[PDB]
């Protein structure tokens, strides 16, 4: 019902490069789930500390 296919190498890739560029992210300002850099640009100090 929610079967999702992933591999070891693919998961490592999506782990390492989900914070650099995300093809599933939104590239236009004003939408949610934007790029990680842009989200950091607006995040609070506590949020970026947790992300660290």
């Amino acid at each position: 019902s929610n079967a999702n296919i992933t591999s070891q190498a693919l998961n490592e890739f999506n782990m390492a490069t989900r914070r650099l560029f995300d093809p599933t992210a939104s590239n236009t300002p004003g939408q949610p789930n934007q790029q990680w850099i842009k989200q950091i640009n607006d995040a609070s100090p506590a949020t970026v500390q947790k992300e660290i």
Binding site: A43, S44, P45, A46, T47
Partner: peptide, 30 residues
Amino acid sequence: QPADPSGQQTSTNTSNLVTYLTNLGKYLGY
């Protein structure tokens, strides 16, 4: 009786303090 300006000034200062603390809390993310 006429009001001393010190009281009004302190009231405005304290309201500004409330506002500034709320903005600082919001900025930190709370």
